[PDB]
Design a protein around this nucleic acid. Structure first.
Ligand SMILES: N=C(N)NCCCCNC(=O)c1csc(-c2cscn2)n1
Ligand SMILES: N=C(N)NCCCCNC(=O)c1csc(-c2cscn2)n1
Lengths: 255, 255
DNA sequence: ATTTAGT
DNA sequence: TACTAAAT
DNA sequence: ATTTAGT
DNA sequence: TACTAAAT
């Protein structure tokens, strides 16, 4: 009955997240960078029709906003299965080349897992939903990620850009991991007996007994929801002794 | 007038050479070797007509003799310039693979030249003619190099083989260099004031004054001819201060 | 004629 | 993933 | 659509 | 010396 205990913490009930304690992110550019504006490649109606609903949802949620910017990168129509449905995938490579590099602080899954003590057998795995979108972008950095969006049927002006940390941006993973580490620091101090591994949006809480787990989990959920993040209730693996995290299978603490 | 002083030493006058002091060479095979007999590839009349005179000359000189052997390698028709004339080139690669390896004792031209003192400025360069053919092959090793030779116009039996060290045989260069070193040892002891470099068939005698050179050269020629070797009178560079040896140009002793 | 070693 | 080029 | 990294 | 295959 976890769903009914933490509506704010779940994506299926708390709505879109927004990390209220995190200041809007400023993205520093390299010393020699100037705006790059690559024109939108013509897109078929089929792809444009597939992509449309996603953009509208994003504008509605305010994750995307109209803007005029000297920066512009191409939106790409992508779909995984055969026919499948199209989804927007922005080509931010030229933006990435002009953005100052930051130290990669996210540890590889292998090393991250070696920090799990044999005693802690009870697990809980959460996957934050739309993690990056929870992080805001400073208005000064927003123009950087603009792209063209023309609707052949009464098309909104021309460009749109993100008000949240975007997908495709080389530093998003690291910036999200660090921001979340800042927000979960207090939680860590309040529960020294718990083991929490963070891999960007993939979380693993390891306790010692079904009790500490249910108590630590409720605390973690309550903390996450309170901060503005949202977990997938669907893929949630709560208080178990065998979970699937970062590809590995943690049974009796072996993998 | 060197020609008239040493008829025995020159190829253009002394006839074919034959190292009288060198015992017929025995060629040891590797421990697991058995005869290999590759059939002769059909040869065009044009090539066969070109090659014929050479084989006849060789049979006449006794350098080639009829034989029946479990060994056989293909004779190849080769010519350098455009139309050019064909000359026999035996493919002895399969024979080479079955012949025991010997230490490579011939020094590279670079190292060989570093053994020339700055004081010795007078040079004399000789190139032995048909050097390998001067070395005999023990009758027990002769069968090893057999090849097929059929004459569409009354063809001599079938196979022929060499009675001298052959071309194409991987160890010929080294075996010739060593054999010649054995024969020129005494000469070296009789002329300690002379510098003699040996690179298989390419010889360089370095003295100090036009006198020691003319005296050393006459001695060397007389010794070479006496032993059965023959030098090319045509390409001979006698008592000079600037000669062409092993590719380099030795002027004032620089290259 | 075949093999090797490179491009 | 092929056509040289050389060497016997 | 472009780029990269391999085969 | 080309056609994948992936990744944005
Ligand atoms: N393992 C296998 N089954 N391989 C089969 C065929 C390999 C062919 N490689 C080339 O043609 C090649 C390589 S470099 C090159 C080349 C050409 S002009 C300048 N460089 N051509
Ligand atoms: N410097 C230049 N101007 N280069 C021009 C063209 C190079 C082409 N390389 C291949 O096709 C290649 C290499 S490996 C390979 C391959 C194929 S199927 C399995 N492996 N194909």
């Amino acid at each position: 009955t976890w769903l009914s205990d933490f509506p704010q913490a779940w994506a299926e009930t708390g709505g879109m997240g927004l990390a209220v304690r995190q200041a809007p992110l400023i993205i520093p550019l390299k010393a020699t960078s100037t705006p790059v504006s690559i024109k939108q490649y013509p897109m078929s109606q089929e792809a444009r029709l597939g992509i449309k609903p996603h953009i509208q949802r994003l504008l509605d949620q305010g994750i995307l906003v109209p803007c005029q910017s000297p920066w512009n990168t191409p939106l790409l129509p992508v779909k995984k299965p055969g026919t499948n449905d199209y989804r927007p995938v922005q080509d931010l490579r030229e933006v990435n080349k002009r953005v100052e590099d930051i130290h990669p602080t996210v540890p590889n899954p292998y090393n991250l897992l070696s920090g799990l003590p044999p005693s802690h057998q009870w697990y809980t795995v959460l996957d934050l939903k739309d993690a990056f979108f929870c992080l805001r972008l400073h208005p000064t950095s927003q123009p950087l990620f603009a792209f063209e969006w023309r609707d052949p049927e009464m098309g909104i002006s021309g460009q749109l850009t993100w008000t949240r940390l975007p997908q495709g941006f080389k530093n998003s993973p690291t910036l999200f991991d660090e921001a979340l580490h800042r927000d979960l620091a207090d939680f860590r101090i309040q529960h020294p007996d718990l083991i929490l591994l963070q891999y960007v949006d993939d979380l693993l809480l390891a306790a010692t007994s079904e009790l500490d787990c249910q108590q630590g989990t409720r605390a973690l959920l309550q903390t996450l929801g309170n901060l503005g993040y949202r977990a997938s209730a669907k893929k949630a693996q709560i208080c178990q002794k065998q979970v699937k995290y970062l590809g590995y299978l943690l049974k009796e603490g072996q993998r």
